[PDB]
Amino acid sequence: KEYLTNERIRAKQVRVVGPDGKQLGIMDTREALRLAQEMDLDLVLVGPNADPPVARIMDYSKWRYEQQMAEKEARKTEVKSIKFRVKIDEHDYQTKLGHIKRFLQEGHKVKVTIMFRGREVAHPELGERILNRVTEDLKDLAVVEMKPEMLGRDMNMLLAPVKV
Amino acid sequence: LGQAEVRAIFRLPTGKQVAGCMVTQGRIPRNAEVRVLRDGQVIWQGRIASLKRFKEDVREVAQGYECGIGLDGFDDFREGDVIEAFQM
Amino acid sequence: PRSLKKGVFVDDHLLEKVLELNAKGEKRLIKTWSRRSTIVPEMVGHTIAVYNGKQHVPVYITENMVGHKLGEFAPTRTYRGH
RNA sequence: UGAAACUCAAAGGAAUUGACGGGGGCCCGCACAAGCGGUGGAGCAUGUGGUUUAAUUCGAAGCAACGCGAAGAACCUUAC
RNA sequence: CGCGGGGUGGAGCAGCCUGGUAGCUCGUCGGGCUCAUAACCCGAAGGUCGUCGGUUCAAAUCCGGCCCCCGCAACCA
Ligand SMILES: [Mg+2]
Known part of the structure; x- marks a missing residue:
């Protein structure tokens, strides 16, 4: 329930998957970060030990909160x-x-x-x-x-x- | 006290089961035991639960008139063969 | 790791028995309690029944197994699987 | 208002000696804390439990059994 | 056959629904703690998501078959 957020990513080139399920490809870390900033939602490294580190462009904290809420509901x-x-x-x-x-x-x-x-x-x-x-x-x-x-x-x- | 031949058992996805049987020997009462046979192995053994003919609910089925009969807990539906009823 | 100074050890129970049977050609089942004895090529071919502590277990002996003591071919402890 | 059958060789009170308390107070110990270094993680070395075996000799049982009787099991020892 | 919904470590349940991300409680195994058992606490193992397959960069997830379970489905004499 924890992943690397926006600036916490050091791993060179990341798999820039959006909040929807859309691929941008293997952008640089910095570029990805910039993109995230532009779109507001953070860069959450949901699979760092994979073929391009899986960067999910969602608001990490927000996502966590949502998950928590879901759990509570359950x-x-x-x-x-x-x-x-x-x-x-x-x-x-x-x-x-x-x-x-x-x-x-x-x-x-x-x-x-x-x-x-x-x-x-x-x-x-x-x-x-x-x-x-x-x-x-x-x-x-x-x-x-x-x-x-x-x-x-x-x-x-x-x-x-x-x-x- | 009767040997019956199976004509139509009924598959209801609503009501139940009714076995239309032609008598060949004697009489089938309401409180009699029933053995159901195929060509080789016996299908089911038990009792008669329900009795209700086309006209009225006749107590004993004499000679060889076709009578529906409900058979306790019948597992295998639609066209049997030989039903043998034994009583002392 | 093999352990002897000079003059490899065979016990005079089967050592002097098998050399007599070198004159009768071969022989059939030599049951000895001697497992201490190393294999000398005089035995090569014969059938040595070695003492498990319970059973005189038969060993059909070959030239390959020469640098070995007899009790190696007599498994004394049995099983392991549970 | 008020039994009996049946049943037990007791039910009880007061105190006493202790023991006990997630009662109190006064104390103490490496008991915790403070500190250092480990064990548990790895491999092996052992001793046991367990399970196998023809037998795995027997004992030791929480601390106070478990690198113990064993301050020396190839045979001996050795009891199996 | 109709239609609807489901099938997930052993058991009961989330996730599918939003394409990437498999949790929770009970059990099982091991330990600790206790004098000892439970309870407790810790770890450890354990699911390829009924399945055939496709999809797609990638499916428990989208689609269909089949298998099923469950509910309803008008005929007994
Ligand atoms: Mg316990």
Whole structure:
């Protein structure tokens, strides 16, 4: 994420590639520098150890800033775990659903688990009833990656945003 | 309790699967087990899920009338050969 | 790096055995524990079974291998690959 | 307001001796800092771990095992 | 077959989009740190970008085939 800028280039004759992708050829360093000055945007040596040192005529600092911004954007993207009960209270469930929706809106995945105990008779059924219902409620923000899946003491599902 | 010959299985990119079969032996009920055979190896083994004829949803298919039947989890569609149904 | 003053070392176990078998022409499998002994051309042609510490391993002997001690042709340690 | 079944041969308090604290204070050590020179990077020399082997004799285990018992393994030593 | 989108160190993801510039987290390997394990910190390895190819001075990037994945696609009796 660092390259030689305009006057930092000592390597004789440089490959004068613009900000667009246009070749001027193998100009002298000084000439290239002059050109850069004329056009405002700096001479960024993006490949010094190459066939003519690759001088990209862009504003180095500006470019770096742009890259940073892009990285930041990429960063903000997470998996958020909502953990339901088996014998479910309704208000709580609603709240959880709302939370999930919010997460989806933000851009985050939602891992929806249901905390099981022993008693594996109507537990999986209960889980199915819950998770599926939740999905039905919020199908327009999220599509299902992982279906109602058994983990032994859990039932997991994955709600992933409709469009990223 | 029946030997059936496959006429038209159905490829839906929407609905499902329906196997039109001509009876040769006895009767095909709704809760009977099914073996599907080709010329050499057996295609699929399982059960009958759904039963619905042209007229009405007839319970038992006697003599040799053509009846569609939905076959539990049928994997190979459009024109089979021999369906053999066994029951004690 | 070869190591001897004068009179190259052969042990009188096979040294005096192989010279008797110079009169019977050749012979078949001479198992000796002597690996200390250097090759003299009297042995050239014969079959010397040399002691690995376990196996009397057979060596069909040629004129080329003369400036060598017997135990070089008896690989005592086995394998390396893991 | 208020059990019992069941269960444990304890649950407890106060102090005491210590040990302990990302409690306090008073101290100290090349402990850090300040400084020099290294090790880790390279090659080899060793000792180990591991893995191979017919066997790689056995021990030593964080400092306080690891250029150690070994202050001298070609055979001997040597135990495998 | 239709159309849409995708295919990237082992896993999940950016970059393509703007023709030169391959990152991030989890794992794997090695070390350190600890009494010891995790966690931590460090390095180290690891991708030719599904592929056939073209392009062009130069393609993960532009184009197409094929392979796929994914979603939708009107017929069950
Ligand atoms: Mg660790």
